[PDB]
Design a protein around this motif. Sequence first.
Motif, PDB file in Angstrom:
ATOM      1  N   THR A   1     -11.405  -4.703 -16.592  1.00  0.00           N
ATOM      2  CA  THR A   1     -10.107  -4.055 -16.244  1.00  0.00           C
ATOM      3  C   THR A   1      -8.890  -3.967 -17.182  1.00  0.00           C
ATOM      4  OG1 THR A   1      -9.360  -4.897 -14.563  1.00  0.00           O
ATOM      5  CG2 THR A   1     -11.135  -3.168 -13.565  1.00  0.00           C
TER       6      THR A   1
ATOM      7  N   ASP B   1       0.038  -7.386 -13.910  1.00  0.00           N
ATOM      8  CA  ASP B   1      -1.544  -6.562 -14.103  1.00  0.00           C
ATOM      9  C   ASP B   1      -2.392  -6.267 -13.799  1.00  0.00           C
ATOM     10  OD1 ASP B   1      -1.076  -6.011 -17.317  1.00  0.00           O
ATOM     11  OD2 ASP B   1      -0.651  -8.154 -17.574  1.00  0.00           O
TER      12      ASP B   1
ATOM     13  N   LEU C   1       3.306   2.570  -5.958  1.00  0.00           N
ATOM     14  CA  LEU C   1       2.109   2.400  -6.687  1.00  0.00           C
ATOM     15  C   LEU C   1       3.296   3.170  -8.654  1.00  0.00           C
ATOM     16  CD1 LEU C   1      -1.374   2.151  -5.612  1.00  0.00           C
ATOM     17  CD2 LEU C   1      -0.274  -0.022  -6.906  1.00  0.00           C
TER      18      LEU C   1
ATOM     19  N   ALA D   1       4.254   1.369 -11.238  1.00  0.00           N
ATOM     20  CA  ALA D   1       2.553   0.491 -11.427  1.00  0.00           C
ATOM     21  C   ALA D   1       2.830   0.922 -13.582  1.00  0.00           C
ATOM     22  CB  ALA D   1       2.084   0.413 -10.750  1.00  0.00           C
ATOM     23  N   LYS D   2       2.077  -0.508 -14.065  1.00  0.00           N
ATOM     24  CA  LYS D   2       1.269   0.013 -14.982  1.00  0.00           C
ATOM     25  C   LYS D   2       0.585   1.045 -15.214  1.00  0.00           C
ATOM     26  CE  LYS D   2       2.729  -4.703 -17.552  1.00  0.00           C
ATOM     27  NZ  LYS D   2       1.936  -5.575 -18.740  1.00  0.00           N
TER      28      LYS D   2
ATOM     29  N   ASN E   1      -2.542   0.440 -16.878  1.00  0.00           N
ATOM     30  CA  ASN E   1      -3.679  -0.553 -16.409  1.00  0.00           C
ATOM     31  C   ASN E   1      -3.817  -2.010 -15.209  1.00  0.00           C
ATOM     32  OD1 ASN E   1      -1.128  -1.626 -18.349  1.00  0.00           O
ATOM     33  ND2 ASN E   1      -2.318  -3.576 -17.207  1.00  0.00           N
ATOM     34  N   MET E   2      -2.728  -1.420 -14.856  1.00  0.00           N
ATOM     35  CA  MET E   2      -2.403  -2.301 -13.357  1.00  0.00           C
ATOM     36  C   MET E   2      -3.393  -1.657 -12.036  1.00  0.00           C
ATOM     37  SD  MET E   2      -1.093  -2.480  -9.695  1.00  0.00           S
ATOM     38  CE  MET E   2      -0.489  -3.678  -8.800  1.00  0.00           C
ATOM     39  N   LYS E   3      -4.195  -3.165 -11.863  1.00  0.00           N
ATOM     40  CA  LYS E   3      -5.309  -3.152 -10.586  1.00  0.00           C
ATOM     41  C   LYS E   3      -5.048  -3.563  -9.340  1.00  0.00           C
ATOM     42  CE  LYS E   3      -8.525  -0.371 -12.754  1.00  0.00           C
ATOM     43  NZ  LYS E   3      -7.676   0.981 -13.226  1.00  0.00           N
ATOM     44  N   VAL E   4      -5.356  -2.977  -8.479  1.00  0.00           N
ATOM     45  CA  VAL E   4      -4.880  -4.107  -6.757  1.00  0.00           C
ATOM     46  C   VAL E   4      -6.630  -4.402  -7.162  1.00  0.00           C
ATOM     47  CG1 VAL E   4      -4.186  -3.721  -4.769  1.00  0.00           C
ATOM     48  CG2 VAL E   4      -4.144  -2.239  -6.997  1.00  0.00           C
TER      49      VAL E   4
ATOM     50  N   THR F   1      -5.667   5.868  -5.293  1.00  0.00           N
ATOM     51  CA  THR F   1      -4.849   5.577  -6.957  1.00  0.00           C
ATOM     52  C   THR F   1      -6.486   4.886  -7.573  1.00  0.00           C
ATOM     53  OG1 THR F   1      -4.506   4.057  -5.937  1.00  0.00           O
ATOM     54  CG2 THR F   1      -3.602   5.516  -5.126  1.00  0.00           C
TER      55      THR F   1
ATOM     56  N   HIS G   1      -5.317   2.724  -9.271  1.00  0.00           N
ATOM     57  CA  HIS G   1      -4.967   1.605  -9.128  1.00  0.00           C
ATOM     58  C   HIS G   1      -5.578   0.662  -8.000  1.00  0.00           C
ATOM     59  CE1 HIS G   1      -2.343   2.287 -11.556  1.00  0.00           C
ATOM     60  NE2 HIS G   1      -1.555   3.314 -10.877  1.00  0.00           N
TER      61      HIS G   1
ATOM     62  N   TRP H   1      -8.730  -0.930  -6.358  1.00  0.00           N
ATOM     63  CA  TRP H   1     -10.041  -1.736  -7.464  1.00  0.00           C
ATOM     64  C   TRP H   1     -10.577  -2.575  -6.119  1.00  0.00           C
ATOM     65  CZ3 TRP H   1     -11.389   1.402 -11.430  1.00  0.00           C
ATOM     66  CH2 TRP H   1     -12.569   0.381 -12.184  1.00  0.00           C
TER      67      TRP H   1
END
Lengths: 310, 310, 310, 146, 146
Positions: free
Chosen positions: B148, B223, B254, B257-258, B260-263, B280, B282, B284
Amino acid sequence: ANPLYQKHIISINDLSRDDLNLVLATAAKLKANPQPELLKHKVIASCFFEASTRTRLSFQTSMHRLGASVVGFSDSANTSLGKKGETLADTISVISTYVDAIVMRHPQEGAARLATEFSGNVPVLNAGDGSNQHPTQTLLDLFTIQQTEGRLDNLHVAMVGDLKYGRTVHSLTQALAKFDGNRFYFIAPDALAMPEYILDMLDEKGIAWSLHSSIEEVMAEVDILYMTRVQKERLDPSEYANVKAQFVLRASDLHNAKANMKVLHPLPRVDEIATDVDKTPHAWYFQQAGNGIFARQALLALVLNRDLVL
Amino acid sequence: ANPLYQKHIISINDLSRDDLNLVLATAAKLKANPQPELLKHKVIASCFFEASTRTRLSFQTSMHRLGASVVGFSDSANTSLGKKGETLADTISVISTYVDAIVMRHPQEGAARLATEFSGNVPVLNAGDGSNQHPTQTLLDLFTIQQTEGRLDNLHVAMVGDLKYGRTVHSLTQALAKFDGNRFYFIAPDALAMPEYILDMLDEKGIAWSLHSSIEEVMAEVDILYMTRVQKERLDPSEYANVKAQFVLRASDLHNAKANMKVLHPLPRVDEIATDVDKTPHAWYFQQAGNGIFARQALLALVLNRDLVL
Amino acid sequence: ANPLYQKHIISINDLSRDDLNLVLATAAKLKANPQPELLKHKVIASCFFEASTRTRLSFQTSMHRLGASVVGFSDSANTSLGKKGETLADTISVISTYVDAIVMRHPQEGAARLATEFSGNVPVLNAGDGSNQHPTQTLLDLFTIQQTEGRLDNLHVAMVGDLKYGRTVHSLTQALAKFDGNRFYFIAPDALAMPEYILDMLDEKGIAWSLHSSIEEVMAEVDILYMTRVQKERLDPSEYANVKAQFVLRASDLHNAKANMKVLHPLPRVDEIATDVDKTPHAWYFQQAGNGIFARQALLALVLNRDLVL
Amino acid sequence: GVEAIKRGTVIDHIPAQIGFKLLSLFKLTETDQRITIGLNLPSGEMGRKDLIKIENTFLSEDQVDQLALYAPQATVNRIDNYEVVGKSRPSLPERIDNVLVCPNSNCISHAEPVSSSFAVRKRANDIALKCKYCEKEFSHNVVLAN
Amino acid sequence: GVEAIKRGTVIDHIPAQIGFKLLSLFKLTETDQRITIGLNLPSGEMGRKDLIKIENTFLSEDQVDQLALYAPQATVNRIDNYEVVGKSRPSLPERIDNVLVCPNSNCISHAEPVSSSFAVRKRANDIALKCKYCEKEFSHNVVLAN
Ligand SMILES: O=C(O)C[C@H](NC(=O)CP(=O)(O)O)C(=O)O
Ligand SMILES: O=C(O)C[C@H](NC(=O)CP(=O)(O)O)C(=O)O
Ligand SMILES: O=C(O)C[C@H](NC(=O)CP(=O)(O)O)C(=O)O
Ligand SMILES: [Zn+2]
Ligand SMILES: [Zn+2]
């Protein structure tokens, strides 16, 4: 009539310095001059819905010593409340048609008060209600401080342990705030601190108190060290961090203590008071226990007999 | 022979950056072009002494996608270890005479290292040992980040929840400090802080880390936001204070949040990730789980095949 | 694509008479000419959250006869749902990233419908959800009737026992009212009568049904005598009155029976079918079980294969 | 008239003792716009009515459908410039989402993160609600009851 | 205006979004008598007041006081044939009976068939509530359950 005659004894909050002194003067009188048939022909209920060694036995010895009879239970499992699901209201409702007074210990705050509502003319004496009050405890405590310190005013009092659930310190704090020039030092883990509602009154009555983090920043200046046990059966999991005594007393910490200074404890003690202390002359908890007999005798006499004792 | 050929995968501390790289390369490769018979004629034991939904089924799914067979248990209660009093040393000694690799998840730290001493030639794969290590989670986690973010370097990673008992974050932390320029932000109740042995390592390797009281204070620069569940089953009673999640993520947090940021979350999640987060872009954690298939397929292929030509 | 290609088999209410017919045709076909590799390279999850002997082993046997692999559990106690507090929504979300079909049996009604909302593209097959539905039992039941009677129309069917909690008879009833001329006779303790929602349906579809106090009053005219076990585990305490079987079948009650009449039972049987019935030519419950293999083999082949040419 | 607004909604013919319920369930009160409520107002027909007035606010598509269940007599009036621009009466939808609670205690509906959904069927005696999950059918009398 | 009564009571000036609350607690809406509620209306001093009007009903002094907990700014108008005969303002009551619930989980108060009861006291910011039973004192904020 005597001021306490046929009055319920549920909270220190409801007694005046007057009420207190009366009990203490009476206690002293009976300690000196026993009255074996003072309550001859009475039958008192000794109703314990929670564990007890001192409160119950001492209350029952007192009934016997004044010539009263005793019916009761030390466990609620074999009561119809225990097995058939009767409410407590129904339980005080019938019990109050058999005896002259009800002594009772219960695990929920305000059980004593709820019983006053269903007992008729029959006085209710609070042997402890959840973590609320323990009035007959304050009484023998008061009797002991006076006995050992000579007064109830201008005392330096340290209360260590579990002040949040210790119904013993709630009651005693409200008892001594009724006297003047008393000074309070409160030593407890922050999870088990003295209830807000209690400080608020200290404040208003303009009484002085301080929090300390060690038995030792106050040792040299206390008259009374009132130790307590962590009310292990009262905590919720969130508080299990606090199960172990954070403040332990050893004969050794009694190095800078005044010579009048006594160590009291409602009992039982787990480890907060090591056994080597038992030997030092500051150890007064067994004596404290023994006095429960006089203070509990004076109380019953007053509540069940119109006229003042000899 | 490949570097991983017949190695024990016990701790991430025992593998190098290249080792890690060989698994993502291979994982990447099996994902695109499957091999239904690399492990044809191999019997793998799947020995779960502790509950598992994902770790065991993904491993067993992975085993079958590659043509190997599986024997094992998901409950030590019916083994002779559970009922006749057999030690783990003896269990591993005999299972190692039957199978080709042994995947094991156990409640005690170091359970997997001990097995390596009784297994002989048979590779032991650690599916988790107490609150120690979880190397196979770390391989599917690295694979997901990389995929990601496009890199394993210069990332800004936040680890939230129980860092103390989190075998998952103990492994991931050691894995990412093997890469250059990673910056860590640790958010956890004090009681559940990251062990010092890991901190000592970031320090030695002169890696930048910081502690935060909130998610929100780092929200705009991570990130990866790596959430963990409070290891309820590992806590000591003093820690029962911490049973509930202190940091809970909601769609609304969120905002900053950037893009590209993923949880990520090793799963299962209790209340620490509100379900609105699920909708969302985000979120993942379910794609992360799915990736356990490719990363565990790639590890089994290397341990058991001397040369992999794909 | 066949009609059943990648469909969720949740409730018999969701399939048509043709759908049902396609499964018996195929079942009929696999029975004579086996296919050891239709499901070659497929991994099926077998998730039993409730006890099963027949439903799970027949499904798993069926899976292997067709070359597919299986992963799963027979006990939710070792899943992270059983020990770490994970919801079913999250369980299904991740298992659906691993497998090709999901067979699930659960204690709560509607458990299987909910899974369809979290599985994506992965077909969910309902192996039973509480006292709701049992569609795969109904397919092996229809197959058995047809085979012993030669038709699914104009039959005289009797359903005996717990009709209320019988997920089995809820499904079979809806399946046979899809055929023409079927006449139902329901014998059950009042407490355990057939839900009204089903009765409302026979009524709408103007199907002839009747309630009977005895088996014997209908003995001479049924083609099928469908016995059920009292769902002990589903009863409410008020219904404990009903724990024992009210209607028990014995060899001796088959005296009047048509020669073609067969006794079916989803199994297990407690005391409702005496073992002497076992030796009569009416007893068909063990051949009925065996047929779970062909009917479950045919359903897996249709859901997962776009075109079946046999 | 009785409470002319410029632009808003007006629900009239609300069975007595249901006016309050609706002010609560609908979420009518989580607003900053002038509401007028008349409780125990008389009706020539079945004897007493409740009437609600909301200014600068119109009733959601679902909301009027939930009315069907509750005040199946209610008349929803639309207004614009103090005019009754439109007059609707509630009709029973086909399915009710996330407001009802399945009476079946063993439904997964309770334990899991989903929204309740019921299929509506106007019978001859009452309305029949079918739980999408459990498939059991209940009388709206049982579903809707406290 | 809003709606005028010939007799009964008018509770003018119920701080915004408290008009609903009070209709709840003091169960003012469990009668076969005309109630007229206006939510979110103005008048200089404070931009949006809630007015509640009950006809053929008169509040006491006890009942009127309880109101002090929610709306210490209120005004109860006592109507006896169209015009405003009596006018009282709420004053902190001595105690509140039966409406609240003790937040002490261990109160005997929950288990047994007694009426809740609290002694109302003035501190600084808030009102402290002290359970008759458990003797624990709470903040007016916490007593009201969340
Ligand atoms: O239990 C203590 O720690 C304090 C105190 N103990 C005593 O009354 C003595 P006992 O429990 O033997 O009656 C009480 O509150 O119960
Ligand atoms: O348990 C967790 O919170 C994290 C982690 N979880 C997993 O491995 C997923 P599972 O328990 O399904 O295999 C663990 O360390 O076991
Ligand atoms: O349990 C029964 O009596 C009927 C029926 N039984 C079966 O499916 C057989 P088994 O429990 O072995 O899979 C059920 O509904 O589960
Ligand atoms: Zn339902
Ligand atoms: Zn209370």
